[PDB]
Amino acid sequence: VWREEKERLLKMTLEERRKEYLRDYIPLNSILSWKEEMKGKNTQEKSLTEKVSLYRGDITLLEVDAIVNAANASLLGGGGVDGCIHRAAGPCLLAECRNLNGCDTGHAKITCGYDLPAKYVIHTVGPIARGHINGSHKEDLANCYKSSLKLVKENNIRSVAFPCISTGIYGFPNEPAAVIALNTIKEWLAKNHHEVDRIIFCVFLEVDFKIYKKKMNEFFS
């Protein structure tokens, strides 16, 4: 049943999919690149501002090729963004995840998005910070983004959105997590910028929005 639904959905156009959406959606063309958002506006010595967006809101509304889930090792769901993604995708998402046998910290696995306007969900498991991030934490978080981007490339995905992985109940401090997310995407884009149209940082909390906004230029402009 999940296999059948998956094969059916992946054959459909946006136009067809939009007729069965259970919720409202945000089209990719309504999301400004960083380059456009700054249009209304020294240091020692690639422009990548066309390739990235900072977006505040519910990731499950985004009509993009893939959204990324801040999952746990079981891949079976939970709270926070994981819970939101499972509710919005419907029970076929859990069914496909039950066929996957979990996921390691810093790895990623890809599934169909089912009821989501997103074509795919890329599930990744962030590191857990219980008071400090001086173990493998920083590299583990970077690995989440790298592993997700590997699947982006392998699955011909041209638009992808990331939530603030690990900064919820997994407790990673917000500023260092943002530095890692931005640096990882920057480094990947230097080599792969023709591979995608947009990478969207979907922040949820005002705190993360403020952090990301102060850092976008130092990374991409």
Ligand SMILES: Nc1ncnc2c1ncn2[C@@H]1O[C@H](COP(=O)(O)OP(=O)(O)OC[C@H]2O[C@H](O)[C@H](O)[C@@H]2O)[C@@H](O)[C@H]1O
């Ligand atoms: N609808 C949403 N859209 C975008 N971002 C969201 C949304 N809802 C929450 N966030 C943000 O998503 C970000 C991440 O917060 P968290 O969801 O706790 O994920 P973690 O990686 O720290 O913890 C993983 C565990 O949580 C789950 O139970 C899993 O099953 C795992 O067991 C925060 O910035 C949220 O504000």
Ligand SMILES: [Mg+2]
């Ligand atoms: Mg490609």
